[PDB]
């Protein structure tokens, strides 16, 4: 019964029992015991007066699982399927390519001058390793926007190239640099595709980009007979007339399609100049050039292991292969879009992938009243893998007490544990499969 529920609020790791002793000092016969608890599934039976009278513990040999599954205290005959089984992985493989230079991103970010937005510049970065964790937890940036990928995990990914785009933006038009925006900038100055993938950065620069007299070095194109397509550019400067025919000013309806502009030091928050940088991540399925810092390991063939070849994660059994990749192919796929093979980055070996063993387990019993004997059938597996996984506790579910004796037998449907083979034939009592039959019989 529950005597107390006490709000002490401390953590207890060790304890001492207190005894009494008497007159010189002596002792008297006394004994006590200790045991530990484990998180387990129990079944409870309530009597008509509301009192518990019995329990079973589902993890203490398979027959407990049979009773727990059928919600009974008695089972009569047959073969019953309770749950799946599988093998736990035993190790980890990490296999990034080897790269030794440091990304010079500062050559873009720390540049003294930015271009005019109408003619933005593009620079490529490749064959280097660097960490993104600086700009993530730093306050220098007025806004951080990332699409397709979360910024916390950029350190676990490999990219084939990075492209950095740079330009100056006016005031609050930072809202226009996003997918699906509309307006003079989003349609004439620059344009982002629908399936954009990358991060957008901005920071305020009134210290060097503005002055009281104003700086008038920047321009933007507000007039054009048609909106740009994604990442297009047009650096043409010509007289413009709404008729679509050439003319020369100061004649009628002759204009310049781009407007000169300037900032002021006393601009309000909605007006100061900002610098913007856009990073586009090319996840091309080819050899990666830029990667985050990780230590690699050796390979562990022919064992169930975790694997992280190049930003791809799973569990499986690695084996050599007879694939023949073309020099421009790095991955192979099956139907249902599952990865099937990969090129080892360090040595360009070709390696297959395959799953760790899995299947169903079912329990064969005679009547509970007659006896408590059981036999276990592991379906569609070679016994070598289950015996080598029962030992060293690699299988799950894990009984507290059980043993594979000398009785192991192989069948086409799988292999039986705990049943003795016999070189004689009888009529079937319980059919197993492929011609194998079982019964409960004298030795």
């Amino acid at each position, epitope marked *: 019964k529950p005597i107390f529920k006490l709000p002490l609020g401390i953590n207890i790791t060790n304890f001492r029992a207190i005894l009494t002793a008497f007159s010189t000092w002596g002792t008297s016969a006394a004994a006590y015991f200790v045991g530990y608890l484990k998180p387990t599934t129990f079944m409870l039976k309530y009597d008509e007066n509301g009192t518990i009278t019995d329990a079973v513990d589902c993890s203490q040999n398979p027959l407990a699982e049979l009773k727990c599954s059928v919600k009974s205290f008695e089972i009569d005959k047959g073969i019953y399927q309770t749950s799946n089984f599988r093998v736990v992985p035993s190790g980890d493989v990490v296999r990034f390519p080897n790269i030794t230079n440091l990304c*010079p*991103f*500062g050559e873009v*970010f720390n540049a003294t001058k930015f271009p005019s937005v109408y003619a933005w510049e593009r620079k490529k970065i490749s064959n280097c390793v*660097a960490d993104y964790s600086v700009l993530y937890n730093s306050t220098f940036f007025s806004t951080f926007k990332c699409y397709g990928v979360s910024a916390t995990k950029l350190n676990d990914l490999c990219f084939s190239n990075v492209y950095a785009d740079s330009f100056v933006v006016k005031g609050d038009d930072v809202r226009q640099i996003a997918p699906g925006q509309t307006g003079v900038i989003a349609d004439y100055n620059y344009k982002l595709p629908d399936d954009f993938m990358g991060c957008v950065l901005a920071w305020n620069t009134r210290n060097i980009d503005a002055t009281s007299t104003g700086n008038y070095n920047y321009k933007y194109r507000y007039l054009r007979h048609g909106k740009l397509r994604p990442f297009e550019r047009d650096i043409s400067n010509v007289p413009f007339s709404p008729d679509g025919k050439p003319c020369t000013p100061p004649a009628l309806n002759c204009y310049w399609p781009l407007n000169d502009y300037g900032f002021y030091t006393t601009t309000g928050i909605g007006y100061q100049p900002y610098r913007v940088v856009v990073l586009s991540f090319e996840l091309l399925n080819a050899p990666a050039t830029v990667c985050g810092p990780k230590l690699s390991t050796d390979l562990i063939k022919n064992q169930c292991v975790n694997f992280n070849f190049n930003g791809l994660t799973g569990t499986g059994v690695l084996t050599p292969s007879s694939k023949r990749f073309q020099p421009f192919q790095q991955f192979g796929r099956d139907v249902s879009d599952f990865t099937d093979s990969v090129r080892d980055p360090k040595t360009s070996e070709i390696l297959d992938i395959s799953p760790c063993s899995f299947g169903g387990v079912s329990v064969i019993t005679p009547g509970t009243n007659a006896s408590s004997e059981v036999a276990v059938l592991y379906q569609d597996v070679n016994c070598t893998d289950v015996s080598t996984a029962i030992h060293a506790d690699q299988l799950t579910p894990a009984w507290r007490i059980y043993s594979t004796g000398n009785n192991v037998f192989q069948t086409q449907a799988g292999c039986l544990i705990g049943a003795e083979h016999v070189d004689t034939s009888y009529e079937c009592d319980i059919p197993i499969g492929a011609g194998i039959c079982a019964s409960y019989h004298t030795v």
Partner: antibody, heavy 120, light 106 residues
């Protein structure tokens, strides 16, 4: 991979000029910073200056007049000359490539074998 | 302008027990210190560039930590090959400065 190798005279008379050259192989001067360092005997390092592509150059906030530095894209070489040289200027001199990560100054990642020069 | 000092001036240790070196600076910096190793008659090498980031190919036993004005380098499981002089340099500000270094004595 790249290799930095440097050459120059071993001895300079007082109130004369010293000059050194350092030169590249395996690659060519393009997008990285290039730096001159010296180590006086038994003492901590000193940074004299660095120059990068397109001629832009940086020097120590002192000794500004004691040196000028030049870079030639042609023949993959760069050089310095010292306005004056004294006994206390003896050191091992190094050329090294500087890489800039994000902000601030560059980290010196690849080092030249260096050479010992003295006055007498 | 940042000025730099490193302590102590000398250490000695025997094989298999860890030791730590510390260098201090006059004003706040963040993740702007690099650790250099030098061996008799050889050019330096880069071990740690980030605040706590191993340069590529540096043995896994090297590590360091710090922020603000205090930083420390931890060397564990020392082997005779680890005999060297060590320096710390900061690139956060425009002027470039290297520490006075510390001699580790066999």
């Amino acid at each position: 991979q790249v290799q930095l190798q440097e050459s120059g005279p071993g001895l300079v008379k007082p109130s004369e000029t010293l000059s050194l050259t350092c030169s590249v192989s395996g690659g060519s001067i393009s997008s990285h910073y290039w730096s001159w360092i010296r180590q006086p005997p038994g003492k901590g390092l000193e940074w004299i200056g660095y120059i990068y592509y397109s001629g832009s150059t940086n020097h120590n906030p002192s000794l500004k007049s004691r040196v000028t530095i030049s870079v030639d894209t042609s023949k993959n070489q760069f050089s310095l000359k010292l306005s004056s040289v004294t006994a206390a200027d003896t050191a091992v001199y190094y050329c090294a490539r500087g890489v800039l990560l994000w902000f601030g100054e560059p980290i010196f990642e690849i080092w030249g074998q260096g050479t010992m020069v003295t006055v007498s | 302008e940042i000025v730099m000092t490193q302590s102590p001036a000398t250490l000695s240790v025997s094989p298999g027990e860890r030791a730590t070196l510390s260098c201090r600076a006059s004003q706040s910096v963040s993740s702007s210190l690099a650790w250099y190793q030098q061996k008799p008659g050889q050019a330096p090498r880069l071990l740690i560039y980030g605040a706590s980031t191993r340069a590529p190919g540096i043995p896994a036993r090297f590590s360091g930590s710090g922020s603000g004005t205090e930083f420390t380098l931890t060397i564990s499981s020392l082997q005779s090959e680890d005999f060297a002089v060590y320096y710390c340099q900061q690139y956060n500000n425009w002027p470039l400065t290297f520490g006075g270094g510390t001699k580790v004595e066999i």
